[model samples]
Target chain A: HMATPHNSAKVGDFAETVLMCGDPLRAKLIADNYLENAKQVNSVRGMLGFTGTYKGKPLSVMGHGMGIPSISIYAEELYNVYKVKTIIRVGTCGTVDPNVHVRDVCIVTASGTDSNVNRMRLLGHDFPATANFEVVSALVESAKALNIPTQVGKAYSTDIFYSKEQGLNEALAQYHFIAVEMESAGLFPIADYYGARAGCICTVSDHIITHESATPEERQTSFQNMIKIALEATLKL
Target chain B: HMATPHNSAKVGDFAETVLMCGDPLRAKLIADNYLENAKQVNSVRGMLGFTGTYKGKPLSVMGHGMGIPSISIYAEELYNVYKVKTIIRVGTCGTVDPNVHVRDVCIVTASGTDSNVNRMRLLGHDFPATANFEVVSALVESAKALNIPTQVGKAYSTDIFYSKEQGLNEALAQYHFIAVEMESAGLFPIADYYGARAGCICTVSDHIITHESATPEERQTSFQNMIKIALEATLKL
Candidate 1:
């Protein structure tokens, strides 16, 4: 039942509860640690997808690639074609907020994108790119239940990584954009467009304002914590 | 000399005044119909460039391709390597403003974009993306001198063409964007970064609000009128 161009998944290959990570390896990590009887469900372009049960409920973990374009393609297909009801993007972000240091997790409440992907659909206005209220609430509640220090706020989903100028930093500070990630801008809008639920929880990979970063070892370990909260929130759904 | 990966022109191959059109054929049209003793200065990637004398003054016409990515590459190299002083983007646009009609020329004063390229450079804030005041003023005066119907306003440069949603249109209307094009957003910022002047003049190819459009005959002649204004404005530089 592979009906899409980018994905090889059939109608039932996905679960109602899906956790998306940007890296395929990370998706595998989620499948390995959380799901029971997990089996590979998709591997198109080495973007791994797995389906199984989490706490006796059907669940899936899939790699959605980086950037708005890549993630939007996958999310649009998953929601529009495969009947995936909920998607939680679990990833890493660079924070501009001084209080939210590296290794902390931030639940994306809204997405602001500098990419044209969302605007392409919206004509010329800013797409609110907000997460579903219920999913955001679940993530926040899970964070509190787990006693994780999580910031719920806006994040910018941008296209380029290395290009930065001084003026934009001032704007980010003024706007109170807590973090910058690459995919949520697309994921939130795509889900919103389809009337499905989507949200993102990211481990702060670095501090754009503080110029602080996590060690490779610390990053992997911190990523695990974010994943833990994401899985816990998925169960709450 | 091959200055950058994109352009084959040596520094001396370019003129101080550059008239950029989106299509290569249009560049050739400008060269063939206007310039005297025009020579093919560049043909890298089929982005044709010609340099010659127009009314006894040096002018260069080059195809910039479409979108911010395409135009920015050429502009960066032209300003950085070739030391070109000014670039005037002559193109066509779709109008969103009710008063802007088909075949009317728009002297772009500033650009607003859904592009992340400038934001990456501007540190996450919105780039003013404004044309050099002198260049913009010149275009406006030229249109007046020529007695052309012209609207001077801001334009939105975007990457997406087909995918549009209703919310975006309302947003554009709120912002009072007169027309939509795909290149000037990058041109102005790149010029600003490089300390060169840049501006844009576009003929209304279609009225998105009214669903009115330029017939093929109207488009060609309308585009020519825009080009005449661009060339005349270049002399003001």
Candidate 2:
């Protein structure tokens, strides 16, 4: 058993619901803007986390950092040690297909990656990381309720960020993937490990082939609607 | 362009020809066994590596540790910096299909892995990691000349060895993978990265479904002939 320094709060101290975000700052925004009576519960490794009441219901929000490796560590601790349930990732992604546009939200049904690291950890086999059907269904329902444009299908989590080139976006698009993000490859299964339930809603932040991008400010600056969708879905469950 | 610790040599000490094996012990063995005037060159991270003369030709044999992560590092270093030409992974694997048995050699024309750390490395893409045709043909001819019993086709490299409980074997058998091993998924693409050639010639050490195994005394202790077959191929090239 590894020491989970993040929350330091023992398992059962937390509630059954959590809101996960990739950026620490965004997690802070989510906690402050949305959650009620939120106390700063975890700051280890600068992964900002909070446990609080939201709309009179218990909830927590935390940052998973970037990439599969970092999120894998945090998610594992939360699922296996802290007994937290219902992780909903509200993050950003690069649009891999023509159908998705910047700031358009998408719900991930399954995440594909070249990072065998997660598959190696969970199944010791090749199982694509996927969202819980309940979480997935919740996101779809929330989107429909909010009347936000959304797509639900496959996405991707990738490792190398600045390599001169890679063909994953094109290939995943050919497979009819709707989005491409960075951490669900590890996050989805970490939730699965505990049967804790997990899902993701990503805002298309950039386009890979076009080399377009969203500024850190633009990503952190916006996405309030995405946060609302996540919280609404989390509350419904 | 990152300076890796393994090579120890500066930018140009290595030539275009590189021969690789997974076991550090085996790398040490081949260096001592055949290379003429061979002197040990690098020993960083216990990944013992050396460059020396073999049949009046300058070639290098280095040990890449087991698993895709460990071996991928060596393969990347050799390809990215050394500008190495061809890397042949002379190692061992288990038979997934019952027809393959102990001591019989196999060549992987392609490897299917549950962990495509290669996939994430591909950056949101699925580039099926396969061996170079020329390299495969080279190994096949050498095995024939050496009269080593061998089969050539697809093999699978899995990330979690313990997850054999997960039906990796049953799923792959339908796809025609005759053997199973660990390192090739990462090795194949790194070889492709620098336009260098890479291939694998693995001796069957066990069968996944049967639970039968060859003793260490059998594969590593008595399997110098497997090494010899690989060396024989290198000698021809």
Candidate 3:
């Protein structure tokens, strides 16, 4: 009902369905390029939030910062204070699996994290950080409708971006983690905890095994396809 | 070899074995009350470190901040940069089990955590966050020699200090975690990673189930027994 410390938006400023990105600029870009009649709702801590319509339906876009701790704060506040029913993380990740190459899209069905936030929710046991089935189905259907081929599998969310451990990427790939990112492993569990629907769709920004990386300019502008897919999925939901 | 960002100590400023506590003032207390001919080695970010002699044996004391992330930075630097061989964490914790009452000493053999640091080390699987056998044996013998009774078991290192999840303490107790602390789970794996020996001894500051807590004065001054045990164990090593 009132403004939270991180998010200055009041209740009803956000729609029931919201899309999230890791960078605040990405959230602003989505509002500007895709949403109709968009209005900025929050800018506290430079974590942008906007409310608008896509295809004449209500929607909201916000930024959840990198890592488990950063994203957990924003997601928890959104779910608890704003009463958001659904949150779909539209972000970018590095591909560990060779099959999921750079520039490809991935529909994350579940996330395995090197973050203890999910375990804390489940009493120090491994929690199934699985996405909502309905949300996953909607995204799949949206991708099909758009004629975009996607890789659907588990993602490994890590706490450390520049991990010092040897063979970490190889091990994750061997264990069937197609993508590696930072926030989805935390988002899915928080959504489950708050009885909200959540899903993550990431565009492969780099190839970890191949040492192929995208430039900053390319990373910023090349994720339009994933954004469209997320918007279409929100319409279905 | 040089001063680290968090610790200003140069090479050889630290002893082969170091005792760590969560509060910087506790490091000062140990230096003042126990160590003879002690001198301050570091004061970076006000995380104090002191080098001194205990019973004619070389010893060091330092402060490792709270939680997995904080402790990880200090421990990693100490082992990797300083070439420190062993570290013993002397701190306080909340007792989850009824049998482990407030003011009782706990010798943590292994740790279960709601932190991803250990899992990050072991490729998303549970790394045995077990203490070194030699350190554990030394601590046990030291406690017996001092005529102090101690409870030995697993500690649950949690990222969240005030957990929102209901029945968390009960769940930890059910899983046979005798104590709840913040740093041990991270310290153990890091010690293993850097090829150093590590152990933890905690004096119970509160009883979670019974809702009994210690006064500030009691918490600061009553931990002398645990400190003595750690010092005695260091002498054996």
Candidate 4:
């Protein structure tokens, strides 16, 4: 297959399952540390992609940049061109709920966004940007098997990184949105459009309500746990 | 007042009434061709802004780049920092309705968006991205006074310029959306948030259904008419 504009990878370069992060460096980290015999498949626009074997099975890791627009491009190409079957987003988020604390693993069941990607897909109707049930169930089971503490609920994907709206976090929390991030809202919808499975597992990097935050070292360690859950979940899928 | 990160202008650099286009060059064109003794007030990120007198009344014109994220930045700065009272977007759109054709002037009364900016502002509820009633009235009256052929109706603001969805045009036409463009969905909600006035007047650059398009020369002439309507509307306000 010919290369897409944003991605240079051929059709068979990517495995059926993809684990995506927002940062290219993080994608490299997953490939280097977790995947064996990993090979870089794409480096276009510095959004890295690597294909490798995990526990003797095929898997791929890639970086999907910030926001709805960026992720939609990568996800659309991965599903439509590369014939990728499932995408599990592994990233970090800020906790909005009082019950969600820094360093907690957040398994996002569904996400609501301030991006119009989903509405455009469903003809101006609210398309539920939801996770694949099988993928979500695998994540929950993997977290339990690893004995990692987790919160499974909704998330809000926002386009504005620094929001000016007052009480937005509280409002999202009131609606049971446990976490907030930038990419899931777009990722879920694109996956749905292609009839591919998708899910998200995020490490809570900060608490919006309490203003609590994690040190860089702590964030890295917490992220490792999230990666483990994602990889373990991938095995099940 | 201190300058904002995205705008170099001080408090009084902007007029209470402002016209915005998506292109910085178009902003320059308007100032160069229409306004007498116009002064460039802002050049941050090459999003140009000019202040001058039109019909012996203070008016300003500026560029608000593409998409919700881009426009929201400039508009929030203009309304909150410069104390601007109103923003009228003069742009172009692709027509979807059968009755609408290329080169027709469009007065957008309300907009539906695929952006989450409004939802973020309205506490997860659907915020009606509506134009200021007074602004719409002025635009309609100004168009009639100028004897410009025009259509006033709802529009859909989208994030993706080249959408992959089949039948999107027909679907929008079914919902009575006469046109489609970017930025207005974010513009209206932000104006509502600040209790300022906002409206949009767009020229039809192409027809999505009929695949008819205007040449550059025709497009420029149609744009001039739309700008005249906007300036006339500003005077009315």
Looking at model 1, give its docking quality level.
incorrect
Chain B TM-score in each of the candidates: 0.97, 0.89, 0.96, 0.97
Q: Model 4 has how many clashing residue pairs? A: 4
lDDT of 1 by residue, A62-111 (tens): 98754565576678788988999999999888888757788888999998
Q: Clashing residue pairs in candidate 3, if any?
A: none
Clashes of each: 13, 6, 0, 4
Among these predictions, the greatest lDDT belongs to: 4
- TM-scores, all models, native as reference: 0.55, 0.53, 0.57, 0.60
Tell how far residue B59 is off in model 4, in angstroms. 1.4
lDDT of 3 by residue, A6-83 (tens): 677989999999999866677988999999999999876456799999999999999775556556777888898899
The list of candidate 4 runs beyond 4 A from truth reads: A1-113, A116-157, A161-237, B123-126
Cα lDDT tens digits for candidate 4, B124-191: 89888999999999999998999998899998988776487787788898887877998798889778
Q: What is the DockQ of each candidate?
A: 0.08, 0.06, 0.08, 0.12
How does each model score on lDDT?
Answer: 0.82, 0.73, 0.84, 0.86
| Highest DockQ against the true fold, candidate | 4
Whole-model alpha-carbon lDDT for candidate 2: 0.73
TM-score of chain A of each: 0.95, 0.89, 0.95, 0.97
By TM-score, is 1 or 4 better?
4
How big is the positional error of residue B135 in model 3, measured in Å on the Cα after superposition?
1.2
Name the lDDT of candidate 1. Answer: 0.82
